[model samples]
Target: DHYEEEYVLGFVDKWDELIDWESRAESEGDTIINILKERGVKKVLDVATGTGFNSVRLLQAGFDVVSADGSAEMLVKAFDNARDHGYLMRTVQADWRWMNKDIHDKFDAIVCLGNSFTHLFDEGDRRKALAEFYALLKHDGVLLLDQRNYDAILDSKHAHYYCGDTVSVYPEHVDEGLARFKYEFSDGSVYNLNMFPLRKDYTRQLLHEVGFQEINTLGDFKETYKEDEPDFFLHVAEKN
Candidate 1:
């Protein structure tokens, strides 16, 4: 067990180009904005602001955003990315487990996008982080969590859905502690993200155990889809 921070932080410089903000935003297409706005969410905490992709998009959608990341390297890049989009990112570098100690204020919502929660390899850290996220959200607020579909990975039947100019993301290697996904960008840039294999049911169970009253899992932002079709799974866990 090496530190996941180092593994993630090492790719900070290539993150923006690898993800391609425009394609990402277009693919997401106001789904998150609608989710938050419909629920009267204004103040948002982006806990995994890797290069500020979602944070900048949220800011553009007129939500008050506070961006945070575990890696200072990524946080610095995210701040610069936000500024490049003409928004000054309010950024805090904090590990999710110790989030409340670093952030003094509560938020209407917390978004853990980009499958970033898998960085925590330890069960204790995952529980602590979820608890901190729960403690930091106002009552009736929600936490939006996304993760790669490990079920498909383990079954050797993962799928990809994007345009021709898409970055290919497929599992290069998978194990209990490490899930290495290879990303091949249009610019011939090859990058890899080493994440923990987080299964959909396990994630939902964690959310419930952490005190979320309502938990709904969506496939590629849709309430209904084939079990193994979606590349990612998003969970909307609400505290009441």
Candidate 2:
């Protein structure tokens, strides 16, 4: 509920930046497909399916997909994408921590990429979200999760600069998940999610407690999981 407004405004603001499929198809698109195929996932449920970027790509890959997110704004862009492709993907705008789909009717696979799940306030929230993900699946469902690599971000001397007036300032990535960013907009609004992102091991443990089996940790799609590479870290888990 809180973040919906941001994605709604964000989608329009970033439309020009996000629309081209060929670029993401070569890059992030194929990355998602290869990783899912590696885990033997076909039918999918993409949660926190913001902007449906990965959602539409997966749909083009021939998987039956349900593109779900809590943000109406994000879904607006997503729906347009589905229509543009002449395909209508399923939509679910609900909080991840409390999603309730029929337990009997299930998906063969589920994906929550983009590190969108981490926006939950803290560990307790993460636990609830993970548990709900477990419930919304078939016994054979494969789950894939993504999060940014904090250590690599810090180790890589990522000392770069972002400048502007709105909320332009240095992000103190010194503390993981505690960094800050400034916001600027034509509306004169100022704010930021200012997050450093999640660490891998912590996410792994949560997956287990949520009833996932055969958990596989991959660093990203193109490269094998490597701590130093600093790409997105993914969790591949199968329901028991």
Candidate 3:
């Protein structure tokens, strides 16, 4: 369980500091907000609501949002973060592979951000998670999923979106099967997170196989960019 291995209470507590909410907001720049608004989406599900970033942002944008995560520690932090932002968060601790069993309500849009999908090391788990996401959406719903540009990372190696000033982040080991990263904090604290290195096309293929009819991918929130340019890729998959 990578959750148990990486997301300890101490690391969870420092997550916000590393994320730097203000900077993240500036970088994201209403990309998701505009997408949801354009679709006339009323209710949203943030499937990987790490530290309540997207959850709180959607709430502030006047969308009914329910935040879900596999880690209770992260959910607790997200709840507190939402409260700090003047909203009460509705959160659920749910494993993506069996998310439907925990989350009964269908959403107009489901957001799986923060490159969280890479946590699924097994192909079966990845398929099950995507299927569960597909099942949880309304008839005309959409899924906004994001992932790191492992194509570039595995090609070369990076972090500008998040990470504190005193933190150093780099890939310790990377191969077809694994992307092991090491995070070194200023206070002599070190952390490593092992994630699967998923390529952009592979992710799109999975969404298609899971029944998402139309998939438009964005590079760093824009529709176009060089293949090795974007630090992340966001897929907007519509259920038809």
Candidate 4:
């Protein structure tokens, strides 16, 4: 899978630096936690548990969370990161296209954050992943998915909430199919991740087609924001 290829050992190791956990937490605030708690969600499946940031945060907030990623490298790093934060994470390496094959338990909420869903380059793969996510949730479950504001990115050129001061990140290439971002670290190591640029409306349509009854889109974490202002868009899709 493209995700497996992009998240190599070296890249996975530097992911935390790119994330800058503390700043990321501040930037995100209690958006996710509040959303889940308000909905009375207790069991959570973090489908894109990159570096275990959200997983650890949800755990600390008293949610039963399972962390899953397509890349073994990411999972390894996530496990270590969670351990360092004084919590042991339950992690699984699972490609989203075949997620049900490895993940069986149903959850009250499934989170695919950090723009991780854009890794699926194919339409069929994206649909299949959404279907799997739908199947893995409870009857009255919620799916929290996020994507970069590609509309703004394509219109002009933009980019993250928290990356280390020593690292610089920018989009190297942008097209209908690919948003290739290059990351340059202070130590001279560089990495790139290829992501599909999914428009906000397109993602919502996919969730609706996949059986989510209600879908609400948020700019960053708020109910209102300028169309091109927020760096990210979060979709709260619920199954009735």
Candidate 5:
């Protein structure tokens, strides 16, 4: 058991160069990035920022970035990648359930990419993470983020998806994206993968409960929005 966790955790290191993400950032980030830039966002916080892969791109485009990850091992890889890409990112390691005010830097924007925020197992944790994200925003600041579209999970139409794992050199297939996996690592750590579904209603209510006002959902970073159609969607909120 420990052996499998250790192996997968180590192997998950390629998350930065994961082709899907780089492309998502390229395609999605353009629209989302323009939105943030238009708001004059200068400093940004990316929470639960795995491998800091996408965060590095955000930094490369010139935002002052502070990234945090819950995983120590992942953060190690994150920092190395940040440096290799040309700068040492400002990062703090934390789990939101036990976040300190220090990780709560005031910023122009805060993001949790890769739909990473959905991993919270229930409403309570989701509320807390939303609260913390709300607290980080400076006046008129925005939270440009995305989450799983639960209605899509209910429809269950897009299973058996395949993507090029250029980094893994093997095609990663999720015959059913919702089947999911929970891996326990050699170092007594555990990780969640694939979809652990939560509905949009739940997440929107979470934002309201957490004091994030004027929250809106988009169909994608592209804004082709409708209430029940998107597989993944975005959340835009303001601290004010």
Candidate 6:
């Protein structure tokens, strides 16, 4: 429901440049793999699967991967991207709130990266999504969720900056549930995304309340980074 037309279309067309797997590989490294392997995660449900970045990496690392996304365009792109890299993707198109209805299997872990979780503006939707994630995991399974460093944005918002290849995302306005960003691409096309600005502490609180135990949040994949330094935060929440 919160697709925010401009953002959705922007991603559908220019996803590769904004998030080239090669660039992300350099910036992200094997960090996600280290985290998952440390927890003994094998079979993974890659719940975000944006452009197959993380899913391809996980598959190459020997994890059985099932890529899912709510966006049909993104899923098609992901499948093609994976195939181009010489691996076929197992994909599903399912909304998070009703994931169980579409996806009928549980896995050792679920990876929801690429700041995709903030799409749910309503707390009820977030809770329902979390519950569905819980139900879709085997007992003792873990969920790896990631988001932008919204804390820094809320504390001091931005005007515009290069995401990749001179494409900039400028914050038009930011509130708790809405960080509307205007996208200025290199081609001079413009778009906007009204994203939820979920704070770190609040997300941790939600994970706790949603029955996730041993919740650990990392800053830019590191356990000991400065609060305002990391561009993203990753939460590893386990279902007990």
Model 3 alpha-carbon drift over 4 Å, by segment = 1-7, 158-166, 186-188, 221-228
In model 5, which runs have C-alpha deviations exceeding 4 angstroms?
1-8, 14-24, 156-195, 221-228
lDDT of 1 at 230: 74
Backbone clash numbers for all candidates listed: 0, 2, 0, 0, 2, 0
TM-score of 4: 0.88
TM-scores for every candidate against the unseen true structure: 0.88, 0.78, 0.89, 0.88, 0.77, 0.88
How large is the C-alpha RMSD of every model relative to the true structure?
A: 3.3, 5.2, 3.2, 3.3, 6.2, 3.3
Cα lDDT tens digits for candidate 6, 166-239: 56666788877788878777777777777799899998899899889778898873212233477678998989
- Measured with C-alpha atoms, the lDDT of residue 208 in candidate 1 is 98
After superposition on all CA atoms, how large is the RMSD of candidate 4?
3.3
Question: Residue 170's C-alpha lDDT in candidate 6?
Answer: 67
Candidate 2, residue 91: the lDDT equals: 78
A best-first ranking of the candidates according to their lDDT comes to 3, 4, 1, 6, 2, 5
lDDT per residue, candidate 1, 29-101, as tens digits? 6877899999999999999998788899999999999999876777888888888889999999998889986
**Candidate 6's error at 154, in angstroms?**
2.1
Query: How many times do residue backbones clash in model 4?
Result: 0
The TM-score of predicted model 3 comes to 0.89
Query: How would you encode candidate 4's per-residue C-alpha lDDT over 30-83 as one tens digit per residue?
Result: 978999999999999999987788899998899999999987777888889889
- The 0-to-1 C-alpha lDDT of every candidate, in the order given, reads 0.81, 0.66, 0.84, 0.83, 0.65, 0.81
lDDT of 2: 0.66
Candidate achieving the largest TM-score: 3
True lDDT of residue 227, candidate 1: 48
Q: Give the Cα RMSD of candidate 3.
A: 3.2
TM-score of 2: 0.78
Score residue 188 of candidate 3 by CA lDDT.
67
TM-score-wise, the better of 4 and 5 is 4
lDDT of 2 at 76: 81
